[PDB]
Design a protein around this motif. Structure first.
Motif, PDB file in Angstrom:
ATOM      1  N   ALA A  70       3.133  41.800 -23.969  1.00 32.88           N
ATOM      2  CA  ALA A  70       4.208  41.052 -24.612  1.00 32.88           C
ATOM      3  C   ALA A  70       5.565  41.681 -24.329  1.00 32.88           C
ATOM      4  CB  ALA A  70       3.964  40.960 -26.117  1.00 32.88           C
ATOM      5  N   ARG A 101      11.219  35.608 -27.919  1.00 39.57           N
ATOM      6  CA  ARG A 101      10.118  36.115 -28.731  1.00 39.57           C
ATOM      7  C   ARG A 101       9.058  35.045 -28.957  1.00 39.57           C
ATOM      8  NH1 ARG A 101      11.586  41.031 -29.973  1.00 39.57           N
ATOM      9  NH2 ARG A 101      13.790  41.553 -30.345  1.00 39.57           N
ATOM     10  N   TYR A 102       9.478  33.797 -29.178  1.00 37.14           N
ATOM     11  CA  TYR A 102       8.508  32.715 -29.304  1.00 37.14           C
ATOM     12  C   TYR A 102       7.815  32.429 -27.980  1.00 37.14           C
ATOM     13  CZ  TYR A 102       9.586  31.394 -34.108  1.00 37.14           C
ATOM     14  OH  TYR A 102       9.711  31.374 -35.478  1.00 37.14           O
ATOM     15  N   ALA A 141       7.094  34.707 -25.704  1.00 33.00           N
ATOM     16  CA  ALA A 141       6.122  35.772 -25.486  1.00 33.00           C
ATOM     17  C   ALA A 141       4.869  35.576 -26.329  1.00 33.00           C
ATOM     18  CB  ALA A 141       6.755  37.130 -25.784  1.00 33.00           C
ATOM     19  N   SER A 142       5.002  34.976 -27.515  1.00 31.15           N
ATOM     20  CA  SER A 142       3.834  34.748 -28.358  1.00 31.15           C
ATOM     21  C   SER A 142       2.925  33.670 -27.781  1.00 31.15           C
ATOM     22  CB  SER A 142       4.269  34.371 -29.774  1.00 31.15           C
ATOM     23  OG  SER A 142       4.984  33.148 -29.783  1.00 31.15           O
TER      24      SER A 142
END
Ligand SMILES: CC(C)(COP(=O)(O)OP(=O)(O)OC[C@H]1O[C@@H](n2cnc3c(N)ncnc32)[C@H](O)[C@@H]1OP(=O)(O)O)[C@@H](O)C(=O)NCCC(=O)NCCS
Ligand SMILES: CC(C)(COP(=O)(O)OP(=O)(O)OC[C@H]1O[C@@H](n2cnc3c(N)ncnc32)[C@H](O)[C@@H]1OP(=O)(O)O)[C@@H](O)C(=O)NCCC(=O)NCCS
Ligand SMILES: CC(C)(COP(=O)(O)OP(=O)(O)OC[C@H]1O[C@@H](n2cnc3c(N)ncnc32)[C@H](O)[C@@H]1OP(=O)(O)O)[C@@H](O)C(=O)NCCC(=O)NCCS
Lengths: 729, 392, 402
Positions: A90, A294-295, A297-298
């Motif tokens: 991540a 960040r979203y 990578a999730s």
């Protein structure tokens, strides 16, 4: 801070630099390792150098033009790299998209106009590069597309697509129009919604029109040259920010309307896109861009994205590249098509064949029935006329290719027959026997059968090498799969002629070996049987339908069990029982069969009869049958909802593995696309074969977790959930 | 340790939302008006002993932001040591303020506390404060946010309450509320609101429709089906309650709580605090509780904590947020109908969110004295707060 | 009746205002991250025994509105029976949540309660909720509204605190906050903030400037002279305090509390609740109090409250080992120190809001947990925690190590 991926102590270059006498730099992306431009490690390094160069020479640069030397503009991200990203990766995924967007942000805040010369497809990351520019010019050429379709792969526009589209259109418009469904627009439609500013006739005018716009922008608007609307002090987001009173009134309904559309299916990409859009609209552009990372990578590290990237990228390309098509055969153009039967199947085959541009002869027993079959195409065109999809001149020519008839001699001069009559082996022998001599000598004889083997049907025609199974799915105008069944006497030439025909009508083909039930009808039976078994066990009918919808199916099973006639499910039960009893064996009746006979005894055999599991009035479905609860003592069994969901998914997944063991399916790519596009297997699983290797639950992940969960289901609901030995060790 | 007693429990009339009488009155002025009434009833009250002022407020923004309880202390000229804190527990904020005040008196670290609430829904509408349960998609999607109205229609669907059943309770509330006003039950507790000149602004709960008929309630259209359809909350609720097929929308503007403006004040103190200031205790806080239901337990919890049963309670007071919630509460605990909301409720007189708890509390303090009864239980509705009081 | 004990006291690092690390993190996520930490510390904790979650929040609007405590209960997956209430008593909301939770435990009608606060001042600036004391002219004119900033400068003017004196305390806070971090004092209490991927977002107090010098503080501009002229609050203050001719504006950005984001949580329960759940009590709540002083000066509130809680516990200054007062403004701490004659080695021994920040609604619970750890580290007995409040209020709390 750095525009490069590494800062410690060698890829190939993909961007060509060119500065003219006026001071306008022309960045031409031309990746030499492939035929399309893709955000691989070579692009990130090449764009890193060019952006560093634009900063070092800013005193001698007046404008920038981003163009491409390929037929497509830019094809988006590197799927072959993202699919390998583990959860522990991540940090690398986050830093990569942060580096990609740092380059575009520098290109965007350069103080100079930047124009995108879109010479073709600008998909995914490609459009994000164009969205970082201040002006976009697209060449109205055939085949050009624009959009952000990463939601179809379980991802989100992680290169500023979510951040910029919300800044341009607002939270509501950017999500609904562009982001949530990832629709792909043509240049004419793209300029209408605002993704493209200007259009040109040919691709040779792009770079000249780009430099012409830079010259005019600097003279007309010298202060706002190279400044995006959201980089200005008086920026007001269209529709308002989440703190605005108007938007805050309807904002709570956005996640609920999303759950309504997704029916509670476990698809995290639309949730992440909606969250990144709203959260991003509350902060500045740079902070919003980091939230977007960040979203992203999730999702990439998640399993659902890996399932969709496997099915809708790799597995779908392998099919479109002749993966199941034979290797030695050439091409055989089709002149006139002949469809036997004017039912919903026959009428749908005639429409999709005429929509492609072929001559169709629609034959039935009477002229009255053949005209009512052509009326199915008229009411679809009349609905397409008032909506504005097709024109009047083009729709009249479509219906003009459909010739309804009742005489068998009107099939004279037909080199492609697609039979779609009643499921009966003796009838199909009779219908094919009347016309096998009237049609052309080297004509394909297709049979749209559901369960009857193609080997047995071929005994009613003289040339069995040209006899093949061409299985469509109702409604034909929507369902994009054509299951091509290969009989024992079916040749390889006829296998390719139907393969190319399926691509000609705009559908996806799979090749299946001959077997009773094929792959679609056999696997979809295990799904509806588990629901009917649950209804017989005493589970509430509303919970069964919810379990089907939340599993990810397009139609709940009881609702689907009415579109499929219960009289057909009763005939298939006798066929399987006959094949085992007459061979010297004891038949094991499925517990769903008892529910089928109970509904037929009550006179509720589906929508065709006007009554089934649901009540039907004036053709429109409305409400479950109130007598259904008292009939099967509903409520006496309340299993967990996930147990109901898993019972439907595992029944199809295990049966799909059996089709792979028995040789019914050659590759797992056909199993996934066939299950998704044919029997409506949930797309988040990536297919009924990917569901085994990509299973995820509280127990674990992978094939081992699928086996352990299958045994947990088998210990409480029956040994039919036991995994085959091909999955064990 | 120490026992908490109720010495005063007053409230303002509830003005309606549309063309309301209290729309011109700032919510801070509604609280100051009640503070000045306590001074008129006790002219020789050493306010230096008042250690805290706790006010419930569900939308503490605009005219209700910046600690409206502290604003009330300073605007009314109370001693600067009297504190002032605003809290928010949704509809139970009014009763939570009284419960907290009672708990602060039991601890011994507080002596005399003012408690109540204030809500001017015509000036500061519900939802003006925003939030995360609705304006954060990631949280909204996960927690499966559903408005209370859809939950009320769902309760009537699960428990089997018809459209005429909830309209029957709506007629019941309007009658008992009108009978309570005509009998003068609220004469000494409802403090009329006046301007800075002394002129009357409001002296009655103007949301009441005492001429309500059963046929008139049947003509009203379901008010919570345009939000359940355009918002899709019906499908969200059924994704959790999967055994229910269709939600029967039975709640209208006649069988639901009303949007009104109001405020209430309760003076809770210890026994020594009352004897020092010459105040006569009117009731005693027996026990409090907090719980929740499936997304009644708070009532059962306060009964076990006080060592009582349903038979031991003389008067039950449940906020009439929705008719189905009261019928459910009555059916679960088998409440005698002659003991449940005997003087009407929010359906008739309105539901000022932050103040309702302290309003229905002061209603039972008066009805216990009027009937010369002993115990009363007040509860409010996925949280829940319950309180038991005893006459003194 | 019952005795209230502190079983856990954690907090997030404080991210600064400009270019802050927590600016992207919603204030709801800060509370959930602390709730998840308590789960990691007690994985077999029966959360059904938790009867309420009390959070302080001064500006409950936008991301902090709609009862953020109840949102933290539902978002973290806690039982629906776990309550959830937001309160606001300006600067001492975090300590009022702890005191209220203790009083609810003593009453016997609550057994295990979570308390604390949250304030994301970079996403929700102070004053966003409005209020009549500022926006309504009728009451603003009567109550003589003056910001805490001017009242702080007024304290230094009356008490005779020079610009060098307030900057001397600002240097002391920076030094003691740096020693506490380098000494590992905040190792177990400060819970780092991470994203949905587990990536690190913040693990230290960003607002700290450990290399602070007395020369650098002297070059700072008086920050509260723009409000004194354009607003006229200087003249409003001197109308009440008519014996003062001029206000000496000594407070800058280096000797005033910092604007930061952060959250804190405290687990409070009874002895029986801790025994049932296998929890070890760290400290005992001895007594609490509430009072204050004049609203215009606004900051002299904690002194009557500190005296009130000492009389209620039968204690004096000599009986208290550590004094913790919020460093809202340097002159407030220096006046509190002179009035009660607090030894310098007992006052704010691990730094304060000047160095680490003042996240309004959470600061009361943050400094409460700071004293729980320092009493345990020094093996001392008692600590007094107090905060000045807007409007002229004050809240004090005495804890005892167990
Ligand atoms: C009150 C509420 C139901 C909406 O009401 P509304 O429809 O705006 O209110 P109205 O008074 O206009 O009622 C609608 C109609 O019914 C009529 N009506 C209402 N009660 C009536 C009665 N008893 N008899 C006859 N007619 C009646 C009204 O006069 C009006 O007629 P009109 O539309 O022709 O003018 C809604 O706002 C509400 O309060 N719901 C609950 C909110 C809540 O609990 N919030 C949770 C806080 S945590
Ligand atoms: C919580 C409460 C409001 C629920 O109301 P209820 O009427 O008891 O609800 P139930 O749990 O019986 O569920 C209602 C119906 O849903 C059904 N149901 C629930 N889940 C179901 C599922 N997964 N599938 C099918 N049916 C289901 C039930 O079987 C029941 O059907 P029925 O009414 O025909 O028998 C009520 O039980 C209550 O107040 N209980 C007190 C809780 C308590 O003790 N608290 C502690 C305080 S200290
Ligand atoms: C925080 C507050 C002082 C305003 O600060 P500000 O004016 O924004 O100043 P900053 O904190 O950003 O610092 C400004 C400068 O001080 C400098 N500075 C601060 N501390 C320093 C130190 N220790 N050493 C050196 N320089 C320092 C900074 O480097 C910066 O220099 P620059 O202006 O060149 O960039 C003021 O708003 C405040 O104290 N508010 C809190 C109110 C309160 O206590 N309670 C309210 C309850 S209702």
């Amino acid at each position: 801070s750095s525009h490069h991926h590494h800062h410690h102590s060698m890829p190939d270059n993909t961007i060509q630099w060119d500065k003219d006498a006026d001071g306008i730099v022309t960045l031409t992306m031309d990746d030499p390792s492939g035929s399309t431009n893709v955000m691989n490690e070579a692009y990130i390094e090449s764009m890193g150098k060019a952006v560093d160069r634009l900063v070092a020479e800013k005193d001698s640069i007046t404008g920038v033009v981003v163009a491409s030397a390929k037929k497509t503009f830019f094809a988006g991200g590197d799927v072959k790299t993202m699919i390998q990203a583990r959860p522990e990766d991540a940090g690398d995924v986050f830093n990569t998209v942060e580096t990609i967007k740092r380059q575009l942000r520098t290109l965007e805040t350069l103080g100079k106009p930047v124009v995108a010369a879109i010479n073709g497809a600008a998909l995914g990351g490609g459009l994000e590069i164009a969205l970082a520019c201040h002006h976009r010019i697209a060449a109205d050429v055939k085949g050009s597309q624009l959009g952000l379709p990463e939601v179809t792969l379980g991802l989100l526009p992680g290169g500023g697509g979510v951040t910029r589209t919300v800044r341009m259109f607002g939270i509501q418009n950017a999500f609904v129009s562009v982001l949530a469904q990832g629709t792909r627009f043509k240049p004419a439609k793209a300029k209408e919604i605002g993704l493209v500013d200007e259009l040109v006739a040919t691709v040779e005018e792009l770079v000249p029109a780009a430099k012409a716009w830079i010259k005019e922008e600097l003279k007309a608007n010298p202060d706002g040259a190279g400044v995006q609307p959201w980089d200005k002090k008086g920026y007001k987001m269209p529709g308002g920010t989440p703190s605005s009173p108007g938007l805050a009134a309807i904002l709570p309904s956005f996640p609920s309307n999303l759950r309504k559309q997704l029916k509670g299916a476990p698809m995290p990409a639309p949730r992440a896109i909606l969250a990144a859009a709203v959260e991003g609209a509350q902060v500045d552009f740079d902070t919003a861009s980091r939230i977007e990372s960040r979203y992203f990578a999730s999702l990439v590290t998640g399993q659902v994205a890996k399932n969709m990237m496997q099915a809708f990228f790799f597995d779908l390309q392998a099919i479109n590249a002749g993966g199941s098509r034979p290797e030695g055969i050439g091409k055989t153009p089709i002149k006139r098509i002949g469809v036997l039967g004017a039912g919903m199947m026959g009428a749908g085959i005639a429409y999709v064949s005429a929509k492609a541009g072929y001559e169709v002869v629609l034959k039935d027993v009477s002229l009255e029935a053949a005209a009512k079959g052509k009326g199915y195409s008229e009411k679809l065109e009349a609905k397409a006329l008032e909506r504005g999809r097709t024109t009047q001149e083009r729709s009249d020519a479509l219906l003009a290719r459909i010739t309804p008839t009742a005489d068998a001699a009107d099939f004279k001069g037909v080199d492609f027959v697609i039979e779609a009559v009643f499921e009966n082996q003796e009838l199909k022998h009779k219908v094919f026997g009347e016309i096998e001599d009237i049609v052309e000598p080297n004509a394909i004889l297709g049979s749209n059968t559901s369960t009857l083997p193609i080997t047995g049907l071929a005994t009613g025609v003289k040339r069995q090498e040209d006899f093949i199974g061409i299985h469509f799915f109702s409604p034909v105008d929507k369902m994009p799969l054509v299951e091509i069944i290969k009989g024992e006497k079916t040749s390889d030439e006829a296998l390719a002629r139907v393969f190319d025909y399926t691509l000609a009508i705009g559908k996806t083909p799979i090749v299946v070996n001959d077997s009773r039930g094929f792959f679609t009808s056999r696997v979809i039976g295990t799904f509806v049987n588990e629901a009917l078994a649950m209804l017989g066990e005493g589970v509430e009918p509303a919970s069964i339908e919810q379990a089907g919808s939340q599993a990810g199916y397009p139609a709940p099973p009881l609702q689907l069990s009415d579109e499929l006639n219960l009289e057909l499910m009763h005939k298939i039960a006798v066929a399987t029982r006959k094949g085992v009893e007459d061979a010297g064996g004891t038949y094991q009746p499925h517990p769903a069969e008892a529910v089928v006979e109970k509904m037929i005894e009550l006179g509720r055999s589906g929508r065709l009869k006007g009554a089934g599991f649901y009540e039907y009035a004036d053709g429109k479905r409305s409400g479950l049958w109130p007598g259904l609860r008292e009939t099967f003592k509903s409520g006496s069994s309340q299993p967990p909802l996930q147990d109901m969901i898993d019972r439907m998914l595992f029944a199809e997944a295990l049966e799909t593995q059996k089709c792979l063991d028995e040789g019914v399916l050659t590759s797992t790519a056909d199993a996934n696309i066939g299950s998704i596009m044919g029997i409506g297997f949930p797309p988040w699983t990536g297919g009924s074969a990917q569901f085994i290797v990509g299973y995820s639950g509280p127990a674990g992940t992978g094939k081992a977790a699928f086996v352990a969960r299958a045994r947990e289901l088998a210990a409480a609901y029956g040994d039919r959930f036991l995994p085959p030995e091909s999955l064990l060790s | 340790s120490e026992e908490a007693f109720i010495y005063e429990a007053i409230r303002t009339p509830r003005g309606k939302q549309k063309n309301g009488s209290l729309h011109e009155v700032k919510p801070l002025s509604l609280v100051v008006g009640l503070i000045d009434e306590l001074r008129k009833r006790h002219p020789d009250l050493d306010e230096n002993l008042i250690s805290d002022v706790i006010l419930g407020c569900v939308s503490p923004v605009g005219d209700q932001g910046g600690d409206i309880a502290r604003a009330a202390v300073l605007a009314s000229g109370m001693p600067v040591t009297s504190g002032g804190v605003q809290l928010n527990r949704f509809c139970a904020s009014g009763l939570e303020a009284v419960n907290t005040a009672a708990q602060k008196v039991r601890s011994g670290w507080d002596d005399l506390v003012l408690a109540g609430g204030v809500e001017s829904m015509s000036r500061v509408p519900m939802g003006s404060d925003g939030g995360a349960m609705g304006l954060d998609p990631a949280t909204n999607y996960d927690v499966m946010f559903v408005p209370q109205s859809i939950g009320a229609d769902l309760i009537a669907t699960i428990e089997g309450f018809s459209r005429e059943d909830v309209d029957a309770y709506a007629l019941r509330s309007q009658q008992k509320a009108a009978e309570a006003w005509s009998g003068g039950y609220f004469a000494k507790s409802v403090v009329p609101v006046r301007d800075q000149n002394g002129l009357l602004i409001l002296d009655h709960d103007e949301h009441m429709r005492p001429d309500t008929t059963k046929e008139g309630l049947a003509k009203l259209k379901p008010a919570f089906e345009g939000l359940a359809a355009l918002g899709g909350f019906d499908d969200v609720a059924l994704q959790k309650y999967h055994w229910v097929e269709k939600i029967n929308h039975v709640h209208t503007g006649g069988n639901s709580s009303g949007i009104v403006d109001g405020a209430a004040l309760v003076m809770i103190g210890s026994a020594a605090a009352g004897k020092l200031q010459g105040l006569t205790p009117r009731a005693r806080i027996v026990a409090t509780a907090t719980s929740g239901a499936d997304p009644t337990p708070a009532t059962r919890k306060v009964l076990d904590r006080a060592g009582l049963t349903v038979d031991d309670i003389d008067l039950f007071e449940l906020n009439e947020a929705f008719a189905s919630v009261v019928l459910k509460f009555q059916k679960d605990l088998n409440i005698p109908d002659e003991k449940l909301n005997v003087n009407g409720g929010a359906i008739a007189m309105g539901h000022p969110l932050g103040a309702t708890g302290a309003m229905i509390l002061g209603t039972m303090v008066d009805e216990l004295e009027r009937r010369n009864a002993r115990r009363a239980l007040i509860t409010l509705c996925g949280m829940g707060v319950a309180t038991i009081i005893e006459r003194v």
